[PDB]
Structure formats: C-alpha cells, structure tokens
Design a protein around this ligand. Structure first.
Ligand SMILES: Cc1ncc(C[n+]2csc(CCOP(=O)(O)OP(=O)(O)O)c2C)c(N)n1
Ligand SMILES: Cc1ncc(C[n+]2csc(CCOP(=O)(O)OP(=O)(O)O)c2C)c(N)n1
Ligand SMILES: [Ca+2]
Ligand SMILES: [Ca+2]
Lengths: 811, 808
C-alpha cells in the first residue's frame, strides 16, 4: 500500500515568513537562470570574461515560454512542502518545460545524488547547461531520466488522468497538477476535469488542478484565455471545482508583492483543502467543491518584452526561444547577456559556482523533496501481490471429460482469480473499465468491492455495486481508464483494465507513450525501480462482434504493439488466451511481471477448453507447443500438413478442421501459439523460440496452415527469417463481416473450419482431393443460406464437439 | 460550394397546430413499433392471428434503451422541418440507436426509394423487421447503408466534431447534434463543446447540441445526470451555450401534454437561433451564446416499467433489450405482445399494412426530408476543384543544376499550391491543424485567407492572420481536426489537415472508423456518391524529431493504415514525398481522388530535390521507379546490390551511400518508392506492380538494401510472396533516438549513409571489403563523438551534396 509521508493536511496557522518569500524570489531567479542556461550555453555557465558567442550552443533546442511560469509555481510549492511537511508529487502537463524540472532537481540535491558527475560548482553547472537536449546528454522534456517525474508531458492530454490515478488509495498524497491552456483544448484533458466525481476525499488523496493560463499555445491564443472570465469561472464551478484566479506580470508590480499575494492565496486554497480532508474523516458521502487555480501570467514572463520590434513577453513568440539566435549577430548576443544579467546571478552563486545557502534555506529536505519522494519512483514502494493458488481456479472438467470440453466464458475465470487478488491485496489492486467491466465478464470483483462513485445516488433498484469507495472505477473514456491505471502503477500499485478490442485503438498513442517511458527506463535508468505491468484484457474480439457489426471489428492493437518489440527491452507481451486455463497461465505471468504492457486477447463468448492448467503453463513458457493428443502424425516426417492457431476462435475453427481431416485419414500436426512474440526473429528477440525449436514445432519443409486472430501481415512480417517461412499459409481478419452469425464472421474472412479443411487439402494435393474440396465449398454457401433462412447457424457448426471428448459420460 | 435549400432561419409567428402535434405522437408510436419490430420479429409484423413465439427472432440483436428518446426527438424535428422549410441534417451520437434511423427513412419514403424490395405493405414490413442485424440484412447502427446518416456513432465521441464540420461554409444548414450522456464522458466529446468559438454565425450554419440525458450508459449512471442541475447549467453556460432543459416521462403526464411542452420549448429555442442568424447579417464579430437542449427522459421510455421484478424503464437494464428472450417462455412472449399492443398498431396501419396517411401528413417532402437532403449524401453536392497548373510550383532548379540540388523545405511547396487552391475554390476547401499549420510550413495560406477565430481579440501585436471568418481552423486537438474535416468531406467539400507524425496516433481509431465507412460504401452502397478524400499531411517526422525527443518519434501510422488494404477497396493511400516535386505529384493525385484516406509523409526539414515534376509524376503512376541517372549498373544482370528507399531521409542516406559505393566502383541499381501499396502482393492488390514489374525493378536474384521510413515489419509483411523477397535487407525506425542531431537519429537506427554502405559491402562480400566495412564502422563512432564535442554534426555528413549536382 502507499506509505504515509510527513504530516499531511496541516494548516500553517501563521502568515508565510518574509524570509521564506525572499527564498522563493531567489529560487525563481536562479531557476530561470539555469533554464536559459540549459537552452543557450555550451560553456561558461557564470559568464566570466571573456563571455562570447562561442559560449552559446550552435542549435537552440528547448522551450522558454512555459518555463518561467513553471519555475514560479515550483518555487512556491517547494516553500509550501517545507513549511507544512506535505507529501507532494507534481504533474507538469507542459512537459516541454523540462528545464524547470531539471532545475528543481539540481536545486533540491537529487540531481547530484543521482548523477554524481553533475556537481554543485562551476564545472558541474557547465556540464549541466551543456547536456540539456544535447547529443549524449538528456531530453528536452520532463523525461523519466529526471528525478521527480512520473509524467513527461510530451504528448499532451494526460495531465489530469495521471494526477487523479496517483492519489487513488493514496490519502496522504497531494498533487498540484499543472495543465497547459493549450493542453486544455485536447479531448483527454477536457474529460479528465470530471475525475473529481470518481475519487473520495477520505480513501483517496487530493489533486489541485492549476491552469497555466499564459494566453497562448505554439502559434495561437488559447480558447480558455480569450473567453470572458465569468464563462471561465462558471465552466470550472460546473465541473465541481471552486475556482481561484491569480493574475500577475501584466504591469509593474514588484516581484516581492507578487510573491506575497501568491503565498497568501495558496495558503487560503490549502486551508480549504485541509477543511475538506478534516470533514472527510466524519462525512465522505457528500462531494465537496475542490479548489482549482487559474494562474494567469504572460507567456515567457521576464524575457525581453520586445525583440527586433516583435512582442515576445505575453506572446506565442516566446514559446520555443524568444531570441532565435545569440550567435548570428552581436546585438542578439547583447540581448541574451542582458537577459541572463537581469536575474542578478552575482547574488545567487558563490565563487565556486555553487548556489548560495540563503537561496535554498527554505527548500524541503529528505524524502519530502520533489526529486526524492518515493511516489515519483513507485518501484521503491511496490511489493509483489499475494496471489491465490492458480490451481484453485483451473477448469478441471478437461482432465476428466477430455480436451475440447464445455461451453465456458473464459474471462469469468480471470474474473474469479482477480476477485481473490483484490481480497488478499486491498488498497494495492484496481480494475478500470470504460462501462464494460460486466460486459467483459469481470463482475465477480463486485463480490468483495464496489464501483467507486462520488456523484449522486437515487435508488437501490439501479445503484447496484457502487460505493463512494471501491477498487473498480468506470467512466466511458478509454483515455481516463488507461490514464488512471498508468499513474496507479507509477506510484507503486497494481491492476488491470478491459476494453472491447476495436476501441483499444482509442488509446493507441497512450500505449505508445507508456511503452517509450518503459523502453528508456529499462535501457538507461537503473535508479528507477521496476513498476507493475499495465495489464489490458482485450475481449469482445472481432470474431464475436457479429452482434454490433463492422464498426467493432478491428483486432489490430496487435500490429501497434509489435512496433515496440525491439532491442530486447521486453516491455511488450502479446498473449492469446486459447481457453480459460491458458488465461490463468497468462494472468499469473502478467500479475508477477514488471516493466511491461501485457495485452491479453481473450474471448468472453462460450468456448471449448483445450488445455489443462499444467499443459497451458508448459505451452506458455515456450510460447507455442505442438498438441501430440490432437496430431495424427507421430513425428514431423509423417505429417502432410501442420495446422497452427493463435486465438480462441482460430483454435476452435482449426480443431474442427482437424476432425474433418482425421475422418479423411490425413496425417496432420496441431500447433497452438499463446505468445505472439515467441515467433519473432531469434536474431531480434533472445526470448523467442530458436530456429532449432521453430523448425521442430512447425517442421522445416511441410506446408503450414496458420489461422491467426488478427491481420496476417502481423505473422508474415514476424517470421520473415524463420525456417519454412515460405510454406506458411496465414489466414486472419481481412476487413469483412457485418451484423451476422458467428459462422458468417469466420466464413467471410476465409477462416471457417470448412475453408481451413479445404485449404489443407489444396496444400497437400488439389487434384487428389478436388472432389472433397468442392463438397466443402458448396457446404459453406449452404451453411450461410441456412443462417439467412433460419436466423442461427447450421447444426454441423453449432452442435460440433471435438472427437476427443468422452460425451458417452453424461457430464 | 454548399447549396441553399428551403427557407432558412424562419420563425413560425404562430403556435404549433394541435394537428401537427397529433401527427408527432403517431410518428413516435409507429416509429417505436417499427423499432421493437426490427429487434424482436422474423415474421408477422402486424401480429395477425396466429401470433406465436415462432414469429420472434432466435437471437435478439439491437438496442432499445436510447431508441424511444431518439424516435421522440426525430418526430419533433420532422414536424419542425416541414413547418419551417429548414435545411436539416441530424447527428445521431448514440449510433447503437440504428432502429430510429431505419424507421425514420421507412416513414419518410427514402427507404423504399433506395431499397425497392422494401415495400410500404405487410410483405415489405416483414422484410424490414427481419433484415435488421440479421445475416444477409442491414447493420445494428446508423450505418452508411441508411439514408440520412453521415455519422454511424459506432465508436462514440465524434458527434460534436462532425456536427460543427458539417455547418462550416454551410450558412443555410441546421444540425441538431444528439449527444449520448455516456458519450459526453469520452474525451473527444468533452472538447467538441468548445467548437462554438471556431464558427461564425454569418458564414457558417448552426449546431443545436442535444444532450440525451437518459441517466445511464450500459451498466452505470452517467456523471452528467447525477451532478446538481445548477452545476450542469453553469457547465454549459461557461462553454458559451444558453442551456434549456426539458424533463418528461418520470410521472403520469399524458403524451399530448409532453408534445405541447416540447414543441413550445423547441420553437422558443428556434426563435433565439433565428435572432442569432438575423443579428449575424449586421454584427458577426460578437460571439452569441448558442442554445443547447438538455433532454432528460427515462432510458427505454415506454418499455414495461418492471420485468421479472427488475426496474427496466429508467434503468441501464433497458440498454440492449429490456426483455432478454421472447421465446424462452409464454410469460415473456406475453410481455412482448402487451408491449407492442401498448402502441395501438391498429390505428397506425391500414389492411395492406401501409402506414396511414394521417400518421405522415405532418412530414417534410422532397429534399427537406432527413433521408434525401443532399448534405447527408454529400457526393451529389461535390464538384471537382479548380486546380492551378502543377507546373507553376515545380522546383525547376533540379532541371538546371541537377538531381540533389538545394536545401528546400518541401512542405512550403504544398503550402503555395494549397494557398492557390483556396484562392480559386473559395468556401470549398479548408486547412485544419492542431496548432501546427505554421510549424508544418503551410502558412502561405495566410496570403489569401485567415485562421477562423470567434473568441476574444486583444492586440495586433499578437492576433496575426485571424478573422471571425476564414478557411484555416486550429485547436490543439487531433480529434477536433480529424472530426471537422471528415464532416466537411461528407457534406461535399474538400480539404487537408497536417499533424506531427507521432501524434497522428491520437486519432488512429478515427481513421479506422472513416476507413470502414468508405470500405462499406465502395463495396455495397452505389447510391452514396463518392466524397472528396481525407488528405492528411504527416510531417515533422521521426528522423527530424531530434529537437523534441523520443516522445515525438513514432511513424507507425503506416502499420495502422496497412490494416485497411483488402478486397481491392482502394480506400487508403500511403505516399512518401521523396522531395517537393514528388509532393506536388502526390498532392494533385490526392486532390483529384475520392473515397480515400491519403497519408502523405513529407519532411519540412531542409532537404535535396531529386526528381523533376515529370519524373515524379511518372514514378508515382507505377508507385516505384529505377533511377537510371543514379544507377552504375546499366542492367540487372550487371548489378551487384540494389539500393531502395521510401522517404525523404532514407532517400538522402541511400543516395549518399550510392556516392560512397561509386568511389569503390560497385555496380548498383537505385530504386525510389513513393507509393507503399505498389509493393503489396499482386494477388491481393490489382493496382500493385505485377511480379513482372517487381522483378524488373528490384531484380529476380540480387541483394536488395531497402531503407524504409517507418518500421521494417511494414515492408517485410507486404512482400511475403514477391520474387526475390528473401534477399530484402530492410532497415527502418527501431525505437532508438533521443534529443540529439540529425546524424545521430539515423546512426542509432542503423540507416545512416555509412552503415548503409557497410551493409551493401557486407551483402556483396564481407571478406573482400572487410577492411572498408571496418573503416565505415569507426567513422560512425568518430562522427557521433564529433557531435558530442562540437554540438553540431561532422561536415562529411553536414556538407555532402550528390556528385550529380554542379556545385561550381
Ligand atoms: C497531442 C499533442 N498534439 C500536439 C503537440 C505539439 N505541441 C507541443 S507544445 C504545444 C502547445 C501547448 O501549449 P500549452 O498547452 O499552452 O503550453 P505552454 O504555452 O505552457 O507551453 C503543441 C501543440 C503535442 N505535444 N501533443
Ligand atoms: C469509444 C467507445 N467506447 C465504448 C463503447 C461501448 N459502448 C457502446 S454504447 C455505450 C454506452 C453509451 O451510453 P450513452 O452514450 O449514454 O447512450 P444511450 O444511453 O443513449 O444508449 C458504450 C460504453 C463504444 N461504443 N465506443
Ligand atoms: Ca499555454
Ligand atoms: Ca445514456
């Protein structure tokens, strides 16, 4: 569970000291200096004679405009953390203000502690200016390479979903979530405001949304800055916030006056948050209006007002760099020099080039520092789940009635297993669902917890399995469910979410961003300890969206995940739940795993169980296994065709083909693939089957009929250097189907049992088998026509049970 | 340009007639009956004795919950259309409400006109009930197979972005956009509300957002129905709307009282909209507060209140079917029977089983009808653009100074072309961008038009190229820009939008849904005329996101688009602008095309021009071409290695390697690829190169070093059955990068000129050249180290120019 840190939710009951405000002004000035320094200077960090164009970097890379805003807020939060003892994690929505985040870590000690080459002196300061956005150095964004970051803010939108995910089951945590006014125009951000009706002020922590209303994005004004202030206040009140507005920097107000006004406001907001936390110990069933801050300041605040006659402070022109070159001319250099000097850095550094003690007297210390809080390195907090014994959930009927038994919905097994995981691991595991948890059959969870809901209740006849506190959360937003969970994993907890397969694509770019976070982490951030895996149950899949139709038929998250399977990072897993027992096998593996995105493709429709838990655990360890109990060939040399499947529905259609081939006395091998990446090039992936193991399973020379769950392109591109790759006949989804019958969905994509039988005969001998093939094709047309006439499927398709099932026995 | 249809923005100046309201109530009842009928009945549409469980469908497919509220709004909108002559297109957010849409088109005559087997009698009604969500039949959603749909609503969120796109440069058009209250929880919808400060009430039409506040989604309440009414109204007011709220169905109020309250409310809202349209002819610089309607009715309205002792009307339980089976028992069939009879069909149908004249007297007529308005079949409005002469934008310098000239930003060329397409086609063409138009270099457009901004103006020192009216729109939302444009295309207009390549993935799922829309259309909807193409400029790409870092480095939109390339549909284009000329070649083709998504991948970084417009146009027609002027081999037998590239940067590094292999006198073919899909199996894609043409270009039997823009898996999967496929050595992006130098970006992905030369040498003979291979590998490290020391790239990299150029 989340640890309690410091003294949470304490009022100051005293005004902020003048001496501490002086510290903030100094932090502000030095953080600006270090920010400009990282963008502009390759050398000579303290500007000692001779200070020249040779000291400036050749290409300017990085973003000023947001940075002085961020540096002002982070200074005042640091003051706040130290005076109060508050467990604080920030979310920098504008992750392109990465200089503010590196500056914070350098000034709080965590940078030097983590990178000992980057010392607190002139030499270290020069290394630090240089390395920013620089070949062999560090990113331009608040990247995972930065102490205090759980949010890079490269792809904008996820500021508020991440903030709200971080505070769940984290009642000591406070998250000032800084949101760009451009980022507020994105869809994911717009709906993230609404998260305040899915958290509880007693069992969850608190988010203080801060709107960085600097008036501009790259090249345009922001919508929220150019509407009336009355509209802006109403909008935030209507979304269940008590909005406060701070305006500064548009006039001649002295910097100390601004600091006084801001600390006074901030303490007022904090007093209101402390009243909320205090009330919540008594009454947590009444949703309060959570404070939020509208921070209205000119973009690029404290850069030159005009440069070469164009307004730069309080404009979009300050967004990247207000001054496009300091090398090209002397007058441009003159502006950089005067700009850096306006911060009077002779008052901020000692003669060693260390920051003076009175610039940092006010800073927090130890684990309260933004860079050091374990919430921002959640791996240090994370423990292994207490897993119940997998064998308790095994479908046993396979062991006694035979392979292919039953009409079970596989996901109900993951449902029961996950339920007991929540019971044994309370406050450490969450399920998220875009109004689909029960549709994907995971509602066994409601037996030990509730959907968490902090909007209105009206009636026991409709408000079932909801409570103001609980470990299932639903909102109809794939962005919120991915967001919440990601932050939940990043602050050191566990969980899963499910989605209908086609709508996973809604959050393809979040999967990309979270993969990239994990890629950089496992490659070059050994101090960032492993977090729990992002477990995604991909259900209600293409082959059984016959009832919703073509809009819902897109299994291609598989193709998108394959684009993050490089470098032996091993941050992606892609599993095909053959049946409920293989679903358990995959669930154990993913629930124990760390630093991954696990995509678990599994059907909720009634389907046969093929494997015992033992056979499934064994098949999963290698990724593909031959099925000697289903093969009629005794070894590879006797086999005329290999039948291979990846996916519950292709396994079903391949095993019903197998039975038709057995009755014609064909000699076939049956292969099953649970782990897509097992087939990847052994040159590319050191966990894949070797060519030796590949050749043995799939044979070196015999024709392979491969029925794949998703698009053939996936498998064909994976196996390009494998033995016998030219003999793979891959069937998959081909952008066909409609509102139709289960048989029609497989038929129209040329993966039904009859076409697979036909295909197997074609591959052995078209001439020898020409007759049976024609019979098989006419039956396909006949089976379709049966559906059109009757409105359900042919009994050959419906009433089929694998020959291996002892159906004599009344079970 | 959009047509003016009917008599727009007309007040009634009279109460709604008692007789129209009675028509409306009959529309609601029959429409509900047709709706339940489609979900539950295989036969006996009018329940003529004997009426048994043999008449009910075995598998119930479809959604009742939303459907009665939809049938109510559309009855009332039908009344309003006829009484006012208002050009009206509806957006059914809750697309799962398919039955309200099919019912609409049956009742207005467009269904029987489009589908003549579906007659206005017992026999047709039997076909109409059965075919719904039935094998052989029609979809469960407001699909493109339905007259009146420009919006399926299968994937929720896109209701307001499509609504607002439809009304742009469409001043006579009115779009009531029906938004689910579940759908309002999605991100794309949340931001769509704000579209009201990007439209002008004089040059654009009007959207009336309608929140279907029915209190529930599948298995949960909705946030927006369980917050205070005060918070709900502040929320809409703060997004610049005048919220109006209608509550009905929670008590015993009689249907006719409900209809009267509703029409009166609807006309009061209509008057306010007409005042806004009249004001806008004099003052169109002050943004009005646009009405919206909060519609609060019980989910499943008019279904049985309780079923098996569980609450069904005003519950999530009504979402799909309130009554799970009608065949399992007689008690369940009895419930179905009683429910159908509650509507009193005996009053609605004559003995032929045609709908009675006095049910449809109130309905609009001709092109004012929801199913026949040409805005909902925009291909009939669509005209070919007046394109300017491509030759006028040619980079002519290639012809004078040679292949490899200059350091031009290619996208500036597409920017000039597009500017003049706007000048020649005013009100027919729009650019959208997510705060990136200028960054992607399309700002030549500002020479003839402005960014359209209907929020506040403060100062000429910051408000450059903005006007309350204009053909460029920007909001920082990929969903909005994709949304606006889709609707703009579907109502018969043209355009383009640009994104940074990594952030195209934000809208992967929208390209999926549009692709599927087009896929359904070219296959089986010949009455839906072709629309203009969704043209997406994919720029600021992976190889030159070295100033922003790993977050901006994902070119895998290519992999996603390849998943919509089957059945010879030809609804996807994937193109790589080799240079500005090849970009013009691709733009012309894309701007003349219909029924496509076109992904145009082009660099905005300074880069060489390789091709004349003529060689560009000839290369593009085939999709790939040998570059004989760059090859040293003069036929394929004489060739030792083939150098292939797709992408401005791969092309650059392959042409630099070619110059390095020329110095060693290797005999190599150079191939450029501009159209990814030309490589697709000839058995799969009938527009692709033949095996003949493929083996001629790439050779039958020699080693091919292919440098690819995106992920090598793309190509490896495309060419599985091409001859000589096993000799393809494919390098592409490999999830390596950082914020670094151009050289470092290609180096760390093994696509830099030096590695590509080495790899060519390895593939001809690793021993012969081992010395020269090894030297190349050390220069890679030397070149990296240079950049670390100096902070800019080694001049062998920086300063190179193709031997083919005159540098004197
Ligand atoms: C989803 C997405 N689209 C586009 C971009 C490109 N981009 C980066 S910064 C930016 C403007 C953001 O402005 P704002 O949120 O106002 O931040 P600030 O002004 O504080 O820099 C844009 C469009 C992005 N990072 N993410
Ligand atoms: C993006 C997306 N996520 C999830 C779904 C699954 N889904 C289908 S309809 C629906 C509920 C929508 O409820 P609402 O919008 O309130 O419609 P209504 O109550 O009018 O039926 C859900 C979750 C979807 N279609 N699209
Ligand atoms: Ca901003
Ligand atoms: Ca609803």
């Amino acid at each position: 569970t989340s640890p309690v840190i410091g003294t949470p939710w304490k009022k100051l009951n005293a005004p902020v000291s003048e001496e501490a405000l002086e510290g903030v002004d100094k932090y502000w000035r030095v953080a600006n200096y270090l920010s400009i320094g990282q963008i502009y200077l390759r050398s000579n960090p303290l500007m000692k004679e001779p200070f020249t164009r040779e000291d400036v970097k050749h290409r300017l890379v990085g973003h000023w405009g947001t940075t002085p805003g961020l540096n002002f807020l982070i200074g005042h939060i640091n003051r706040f953390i130290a005076d109060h003892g508050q467990n604080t994690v920030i979310i920098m929505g504008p992750g392109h203000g990465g200089p503010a985040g590196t500056s914070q870590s350098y000034l709080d000690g965590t940078y030097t502690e983590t990178f000992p080459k980057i010392t607190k002196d002139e030499a270290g300061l020069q290394k630090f200016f240089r390395q920013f956005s620089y070949p062999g150095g560090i990113p331009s964004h608040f990247a995972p390479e930065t102490p205090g970051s759980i949010h890079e803010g490269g792809e904008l939108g996820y500021a508020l979903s991440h903030a709200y995910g971080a505070i769940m089951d984290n009642p000591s945590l406070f998250v000032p979530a800084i949101v760009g006014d451009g980022e507020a125009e994105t869809g994911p951000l717009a709906t993230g405001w609404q998260s305040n009706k899915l958290v509880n002020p007693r069992t969850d922590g608190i988010v203080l949304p801060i709107l960085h209303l600097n008036g501009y994005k790259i090249a345009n004004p922001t919508i929220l800055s150019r509407i009336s202030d009355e509209e802006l206040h109403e909008f935030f009140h209507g979304m269940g916030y008590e909005p406060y507005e701070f305006v500064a920097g548009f006039d001649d107000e002295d910097h100390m006056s601004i600091h006084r006004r801001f600390a006074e406001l901030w303490e007022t907001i904090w007093d209101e948050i402390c009243d909320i936390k205090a009330t919540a110990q008594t009454d947590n069933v009444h949703r309060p209006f959570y404070p939020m801050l509208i921070f209205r300041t000119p973009k690029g605040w404290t850069c030159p007002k005009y440069i070469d006659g164009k307004k730069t402070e309080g404009s979009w022109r300050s967004h990247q760099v207000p001054l496009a070159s300091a090398r090209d001319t002397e007058a441009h250099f003159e502006v950089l020099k005067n700009w850096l000097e306006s911060y009077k850095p002779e008052e901020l550094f000692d003669a060693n080039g260390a920051v003076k003690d009175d610039v940092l007297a006010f800073m927090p210390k130890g684990e309260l520092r933004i860079g050091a809080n374990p919430n921002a390195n959640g791996g240090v907090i994370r423990n292994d789940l207490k897993l119940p014994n997998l064998e308790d959930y095994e479908v046993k009927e396979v062991a006694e009635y035979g392979h292919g038994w039953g009409q079970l919905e596989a996901t109900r097994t993951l449902g029961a297993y996950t339920r007991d995981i929540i019971k044994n691991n309370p406050r450490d595991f969450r399920i998220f669902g875009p109004d689909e948890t029960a549709s994907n059959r995971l509602q066994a969870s409601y037996e030990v917890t509730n959907k968490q809901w902090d909007a209105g209740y009206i009636s026991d006849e409709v408000d079932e399995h909801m409570h103001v506190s609980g470990q299932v959360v639903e909102q109809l937003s794939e962005h919120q469910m991915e967001g919440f969970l990601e932050a939940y994993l990043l602050t050191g907890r566990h969980g899963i979410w499910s989605s209908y397969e086609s709508f996973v694509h809604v959050i393809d770019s979040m999967l990309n961003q979270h993969a990239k976070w994990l890629e950089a982490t496992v490659r070059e951030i050994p101090w960032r300890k492993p977090i729990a895996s992002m477990n995604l149950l991909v259900s209600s899949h293409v082959w059984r969206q016959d009832h919703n139709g073509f809009s819902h038929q897109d299994p291609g998250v598989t193709s998108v995940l394959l684009n993050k399977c490089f470098h032996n990072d091993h941050v992606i897993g892609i599993y095909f739940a053959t049946d409920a027992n293989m679903l358990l096998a995959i669930a154990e593996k993913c629930y124990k795993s760390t630093n991954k995105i696990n995509a678990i493709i599994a059907g909720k429709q009634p389907a046969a169980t093929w494997l015992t838990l033992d056979e499934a655990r064994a098949e999963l360890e290698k990724g593909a296994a031959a099925w000697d109990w289903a093969s009629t060939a005794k070894n590879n040399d006797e086999a005329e065709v290999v039948l291979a499947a990846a996916g519950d529905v292709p396994t079903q259609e391949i095993m019903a083909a197998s039975d038709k081939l057995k009755e014609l006395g064909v000699k076939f091998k049956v292969v099953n693939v649970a782990d897509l990446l097992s087939l990847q090039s052994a040159k590319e992936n050191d966990e894949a089957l070797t060519d030796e193991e590949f050749a043995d399973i799939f044979t070196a020379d015999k024709p392979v009929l491969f029925a794949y769950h998703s698009y053939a392109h996936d498998v064909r591109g994976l196996i390009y250097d494998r033995p016998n790759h030219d003999n793979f006949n891959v069937h998959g989804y081909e952008e066909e189907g409609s509102t139709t019958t289960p048989y029609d969905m497989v038929r129209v994509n040329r993966i039904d049992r009859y076409e697979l039988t036909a295909e197997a005969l074609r591959m052995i001998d078209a001439d020898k088998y020409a007759d049976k093939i024609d019979e098989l094709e006419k039956f396909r047309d006949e089976a379709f026509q049966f559906a059109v006439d009757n409105g359900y499927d042919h009994p050959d398709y419906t009433d089929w049970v694998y020959s291996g099932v002892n159906t004599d026995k009344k079970g």
